[PDB]
Design a protein around this nucleic acid. Structure first.
Length: 175
DNA sequence: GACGG
DNA sequence: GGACG
């Protein structure tokens, strides 16, 4: 229902954009599992808010990257906003920032240098920065590393496609 | 502009 | 198994 994480997008749309237009415009980006136009309890009208759940986080991220800022109708004045949605549990409505989506955390052989890591992970997208966690006295690698990509979908692709022995997960922010 | 079926 | 002087 909510698996995998970061596979649901949050939309700020026109109150007059129906679910069918969301399906037509967002289905190219992946396997849609649920489209949900949020309606006001008292008027039963759209609040101008929607959720779209995709089968993969990479699909949700590509949808966000391509569709944020687009318009969906002639009567629509403002562009739509598309974010990765917060979970139902907790998630105090705060917008997920791109910095929380672009960096992955991997287990790697001790022999890897930062350029070895970049070589193995450049195939999933444009890498902004690679680092390896080392003993800062001796310089020896602790076998853990970070890869930050330019786009959230690139980090999602890496997590979904790289060898399972890397144990690739989204990296928590430092603070 | 944030949570149903 | 797992975290950034």
């Amino acid at each position: 229902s909510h698996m995998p994480p970061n596979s649901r997008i949050f939309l700020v749309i026109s109150k007059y954009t129906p679910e069918s237009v969301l399906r037509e415009r967002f289905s190219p980006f992946g396997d849609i599992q649920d489209i949900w136009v949020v309606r006001d309890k008292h008027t039963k009208e759209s609040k101008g808010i929607a959720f779209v759940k995709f089968a993969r986080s990479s699909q949700a991220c590509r949808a966000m990257e391509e569709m944020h800022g687009q318009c969906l109708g002639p009567n629509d004045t403002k562009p739509i906003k598309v974010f990765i949605a917060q979970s139902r549990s907790s998630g105090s409505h705060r917008d997920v920032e791109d910095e929380e989506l672009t960096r992955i955390f991997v287990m790697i052989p001790k022999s890897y240098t930062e350029e070895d890591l970049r070589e193995k992970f450049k195939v999933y997208g444009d890498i902004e920065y690679c680092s390896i966690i080392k003993n800062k006295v001796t310089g020896e690698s602790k076998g853990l590393g970070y890869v930050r990509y330019l786009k959230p979908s690139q980090a999602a692709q890496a997590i979904e496609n790289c060898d399972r022995s890397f144990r690739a997960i989204l990296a928590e922010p430092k603070n």
